[PDB]
Design a protein around this motif. Sequence first.
Motif, PDB file in Angstrom:
ATOM      1  N   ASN A  34     -40.121  21.083 -15.574  1.00 24.41           N
ATOM      2  CA  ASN A  34     -40.841  19.988 -14.935  1.00 24.41           C
ATOM      3  C   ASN A  34     -41.656  19.213 -15.961  1.00 24.41           C
ATOM      4  OD1 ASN A  34     -39.937  20.200 -12.301  1.00 24.41           O
ATOM      5  ND2 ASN A  34     -41.992  20.428 -11.426  1.00 24.41           N
ATOM      6  N   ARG A 138     -39.318  16.309 -11.118  1.00 25.45           N
ATOM      7  CA  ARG A 138     -38.958  16.666  -9.754  1.00 25.45           C
ATOM      8  C   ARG A 138     -37.634  16.051  -9.325  1.00 25.45           C
ATOM      9  NH1 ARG A 138     -44.671  15.834  -6.613  1.00 25.45           N
ATOM     10  NH2 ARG A 138     -44.664  14.202  -8.220  1.00 25.45           N
ATOM     11  N   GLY A 139     -36.968  15.331 -10.216  1.00 23.80           N
ATOM     12  CA  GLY A 139     -35.666  14.769  -9.913  1.00 23.80           C
ATOM     13  C   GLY A 139     -35.143  14.032 -11.125  1.00 23.80           C
ATOM     14  N   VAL A 140     -33.886  13.595 -11.015  1.00 21.31           N
ATOM     15  CA  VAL A 140     -33.301  12.794 -12.085  1.00 21.31           C
ATOM     16  C   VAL A 140     -34.077  11.498 -12.258  1.00 21.31           C
ATOM     17  CG1 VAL A 140     -31.336  11.259 -12.484  1.00 21.31           C
ATOM     18  CG2 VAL A 140     -30.974  13.723 -12.255  1.00 21.31           C
ATOM     19  N   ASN A 141     -34.719  11.017 -11.194  1.00 18.47           N
ATOM     20  CA  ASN A 141     -35.533   9.806 -11.262  1.00 18.47           C
ATOM     21  C   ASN A 141     -36.887  10.145 -11.888  1.00 18.47           C
ATOM     22  OD1 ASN A 141     -33.407   8.598  -9.529  1.00 18.47           O
ATOM     23  ND2 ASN A 141     -34.939   6.979  -9.255  1.00 18.47           N
ATOM     24  N   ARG A 197     -32.477  11.058 -24.043  1.00 19.91           N
ATOM     25  CA  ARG A 197     -32.174  12.468 -24.235  1.00 19.91           C
ATOM     26  C   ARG A 197     -33.101  13.030 -25.301  1.00 19.91           C
ATOM     27  NH1 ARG A 197     -26.456  12.105 -24.212  1.00 19.91           N
ATOM     28  NH2 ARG A 197     -26.279  13.657 -25.887  1.00 19.91           N
ATOM     29  N   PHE A 288     -27.710   3.908 -22.686  1.00 18.39           N
ATOM     30  CA  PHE A 288     -27.778   2.853 -21.682  1.00 18.39           C
ATOM     31  C   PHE A 288     -27.447   3.435 -20.311  1.00 18.39           C
ATOM     32  CE2 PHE A 288     -26.384  -0.833 -19.276  1.00 18.39           C
ATOM     33  CZ  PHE A 288     -27.330  -1.778 -19.617  1.00 18.39           C
ATOM     34  N   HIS A 290     -27.367   2.176 -16.377  1.00 23.77           N
ATOM     35  CA  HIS A 290     -27.454   1.014 -15.507  1.00 23.77           C
ATOM     36  C   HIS A 290     -28.600   1.191 -14.521  1.00 23.77           C
ATOM     37  CE1 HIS A 290     -25.740  -2.529 -13.396  1.00 23.77           C
ATOM     38  NE2 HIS A 290     -25.121  -2.712 -14.549  1.00 23.77           N
ATOM     39  N   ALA A 306     -33.439  11.193 -17.240  1.00 25.63           N
ATOM     40  CA  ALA A 306     -32.500  11.682 -16.243  1.00 25.63           C
ATOM     41  C   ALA A 306     -31.905  13.019 -16.630  1.00 25.63           C
ATOM     42  CB  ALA A 306     -31.381  10.657 -16.033  1.00 25.63           C
ATOM     43  N   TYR A 307     -32.344  13.580 -17.751  1.00 28.70           N
ATOM     44  CA  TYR A 307     -31.789  14.809 -18.305  1.00 28.70           C
ATOM     45  C   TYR A 307     -32.953  15.749 -18.600  1.00 28.70           C
ATOM     46  CZ  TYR A 307     -28.003  17.482 -20.446  1.00 28.70           C
ATOM     47  OH  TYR A 307     -27.061  18.438 -20.734  1.00 28.70           O
ATOM     48  N   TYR A 309     -32.563  18.659 -19.101  1.00 31.05           N
ATOM     49  CA  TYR A 309     -31.990  19.608 -20.048  1.00 31.05           C
ATOM     50  C   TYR A 309     -32.223  19.094 -21.467  1.00 31.05           C
ATOM     51  CZ  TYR A 309     -29.691  21.929 -16.120  1.00 31.05           C
ATOM     52  OH  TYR A 309     -29.428  22.610 -14.954  1.00 31.05           O
TER      53      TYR A 309
ATOM     54  N   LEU B 181     -32.406  15.234  -5.356  1.00 28.51           N
ATOM     55  CA  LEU B 181     -33.314  15.525  -6.457  1.00 28.51           C
ATOM     56  C   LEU B 181     -32.600  15.625  -7.796  1.00 28.51           C
ATOM     57  CD1 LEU B 181     -35.226  15.730  -4.235  1.00 28.51           C
ATOM     58  CD2 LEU B 181     -35.830  18.058  -4.911  1.00 28.51           C
ATOM     59  N   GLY B 183     -29.570  14.713  -8.724  1.00 29.00           N
ATOM     60  CA  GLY B 183     -28.380  13.897  -8.762  1.00 29.00           C
ATOM     61  C   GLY B 183     -28.678  12.511  -9.300  1.00 29.00           C
TER      62      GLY B 183
ATOM     63  N   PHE C 288     -21.943   3.282 -24.829  1.00 26.25           N
ATOM     64  CA  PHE C 288     -22.113   1.867 -24.524  1.00 26.25           C
ATOM     65  C   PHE C 288     -23.546   1.449 -24.839  1.00 26.25           C
ATOM     66  CE2 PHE C 288     -22.721  -1.880 -21.896  1.00 26.25           C
ATOM     67  CZ  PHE C 288     -21.545  -2.573 -22.100  1.00 26.25           C
TER      68      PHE C 288
END
Lengths: 338, 338, 338
Positions: A34, A138-141, A197, A288, A290, A306-307, A309, B181, B183, C288
């Motif tokens: 987190n 708490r999420g990819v966002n 990343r 990049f 989108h 978004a990662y 990991y 979450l 995704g 990209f």
Amino acid sequence: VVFCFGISAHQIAMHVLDYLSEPVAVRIDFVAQNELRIPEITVCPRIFQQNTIFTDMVEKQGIDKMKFLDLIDRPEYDIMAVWNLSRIFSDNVSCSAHEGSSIISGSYVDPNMSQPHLVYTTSGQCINIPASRPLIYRGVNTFVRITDSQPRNLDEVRPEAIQIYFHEHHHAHLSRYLTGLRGYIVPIANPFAFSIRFTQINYANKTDSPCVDSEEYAACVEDFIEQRIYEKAQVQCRLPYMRPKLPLCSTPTDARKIFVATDDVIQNFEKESSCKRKCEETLYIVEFMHLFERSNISIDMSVYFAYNYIQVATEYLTYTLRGLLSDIGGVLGLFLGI
Amino acid sequence: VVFCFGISAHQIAMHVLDYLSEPVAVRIDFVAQNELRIPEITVCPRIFQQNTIFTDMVEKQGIDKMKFLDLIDRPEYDIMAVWNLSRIFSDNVSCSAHEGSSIISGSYVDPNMSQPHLVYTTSGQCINIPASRPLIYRGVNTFVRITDSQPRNLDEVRPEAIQIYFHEHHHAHLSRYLTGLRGYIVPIANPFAFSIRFTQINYANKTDSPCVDSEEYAACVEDFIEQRIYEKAQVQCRLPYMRPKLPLCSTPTDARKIFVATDDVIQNFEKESSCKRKCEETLYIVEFMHLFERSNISIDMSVYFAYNYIQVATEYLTYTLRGLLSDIGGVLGLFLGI
Amino acid sequence: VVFCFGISAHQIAMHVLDYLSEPVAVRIDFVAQNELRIPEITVCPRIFQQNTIFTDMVEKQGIDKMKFLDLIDRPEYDIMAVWNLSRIFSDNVSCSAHEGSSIISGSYVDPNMSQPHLVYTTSGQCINIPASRPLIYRGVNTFVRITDSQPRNLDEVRPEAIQIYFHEHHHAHLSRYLTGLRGYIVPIANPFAFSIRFTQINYANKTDSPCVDSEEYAACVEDFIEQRIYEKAQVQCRLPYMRPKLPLCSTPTDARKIFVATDDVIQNFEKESSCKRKCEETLYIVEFMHLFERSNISIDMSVYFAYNYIQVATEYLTYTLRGLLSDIGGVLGLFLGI
């Protein structure tokens, strides 16, 4: 048995030689947490010549690629009166931390974060964004948004291709003399968003002693770049930060011409200046992604994470290396049996 | 020599301590094979509040953020009558496997694959796509296409930003309680295509025994998430899957309100639930590849595999670690000689 | 003690077995250097059937998917008269090396580089771009631009989705028989630019002896692919490169039909042909990056190197592996003490 003794001495010599450093990337592992170590973002136009704002200002006011003090238009252009002419994005900095999502409430936000840290740079002025608080995945966002809701949207000579440098925490030199070189140019005609990343390469500390060289490195390199600028360019007339140390010198083309020349010369300094390394260097793989968001904001740079990991490549140190090279004494003894 | 004996005992103690686990990423190597392990794709709207379909349905029918059973519009809204209201993309699922290209024939296709696996999820309904057959990497054009040629194109309140979760094979819990979450949200106004770089991190199995925890983990976490939903939310009235076990309870706001609240609470469960790890976890680095294809399809999610070079980071186990820490007895003997 | 002797013999047997190869990715480290090893770029249409130019030419001139010599339109179509019909981009190749940026001057360019190397390929004709000189990483703006300022812009039946294959230096076979399979298709309606992350995987050399198999591999695989094309397709009438070796045979559908069939059959050859591996293989992670440049050029492929941090995964060889497996004799002796 003198031959075997000599070969064993050579084996121990290789042991000792390997003892120094010998950093192996023990764990390039994908850790999801987190807690997020946000990059230090500098939102700055790449260079005076490249930037449209500075070029237009100098063309309509002065002559040539800046420099010459712009005396013809006005003899009152101080050194800062032109350096701060780099104002592109500031006074409305938001480090909005979109932490994540949730089914019951969702849309987690944190508007209060990191303020507009105005830092001067070879570009003239940038907005460094300190990592006040680690973020929550708490999420990819998980995107930290740098927003400058400028007056009138700054649509008059708006900087089309501003530069975004993701540098490590508490580095003045990176944000002040390497933003036009080691930074990623970003168009802002649309709400661009980049995935970052994480490659937290924690190098070792031996024979290149960083000794947690995470904050010292910053000031050392900053003062060293400024020192080279002072030394190679034989001009001490420029204001030495504080005014009451030496007389002001801004009108002579010295300040612009020779200082820019020397700063360009010392652009490649990692070879010139050594013994310093960020033992906790973290690399930001900029990719990049989108974005689907009609962000009318002038700049809404969404540094996405978004990662979770993080590809942490911890450059561990094999202490067992010395132990094994000493175990080589066991094979020494087995030859001795022969 | 008691001192040396004690130091050697300490050395053996470090040996035994390192014996447990000690997983080193021996081979992060780029392996290229025709065989492809396709990700398990869940095509689901992220959340009820985020999704436009559910929000519009509840706003025109009921009140507030779903919940309350939507009694005012109709008292017959069962629990599933609202949960299945999540229908976004299904009944026409194609896992089209564009295997590769070839000069003599080219355009290799495989329309029959993986069917519309309808799986309920916190979003309400999703289309999980099992990996029926590994794919063949005959070219960079190795993209598995998820296509839902919906009736009328579903242009009425079409889901603009549906979510796409690439989770590992045979994981109900990931597809049922972590799609909003963990995704990646994907706009579908254009035929978006994402490269999926593969990081097959085969962790070790010791002191965290997965014992090939590739299929058990799924059901364990699924039932545990449901169990926490039941426990923390003190409501047993909700239908327990099979109808003939306890009475139906859907009209009371219990089912929506309290169950959503608890599910949100247990959103972060990896800390709450432990002892389970996918020993064969594969990470899907989602990247943006530009697509040149005028796909009129409503959703034509092209999960590209343009990188046969799977970055397999096999977290091998160093059995020689124990052997070497025992060889340390050799250096033990060399001290004893001293 | 015979039991211990046997167990120790087994231990030494495992030692010797591990001696062969045992390549561990010792250093997947992110090295930043001014020197850049540019990929060898092949700008070729993927395949005759896929390419619009060849399909249109054959449709209006001949019949079927090429082949048959196009005798009806004209009986003078030689083998090369159709193979060179693949001319898509050539005679104006520029490997422009945008080295970096600088505050004093900026916009560093190098127009003279690598010339139009015309190489025939299964697509018919491609422009291989040799790495004449390593590039300098003076900034994130390190992009090698492949430009073909074609006559009239080549707007008549312009190739919409040409293929770009980034293969390693001096590889004829990769550029001649694997460009439509192992290459990335790229639209050229807009000035597309791709980041090329570098993964210089220097594999080891043992039991798969490459013996710096960086240039030999090329010719070996090229001649072997051609040899399989000759062997499986029982047609020696085709021109064997030099005309004065065997009679010309182009009119019979042999040259097109059977040769294309066999070349397709030998498309998967890494399994068919072995003992060869590029010990210095470098992988180009194509990503990209959004480009802000109104490049009116017909093709202005910007192979960006925005990541000086080459992820060099040097597959080192653990010579200490043999030493440690021999140290196992120390634990042998410790059992003997028991």
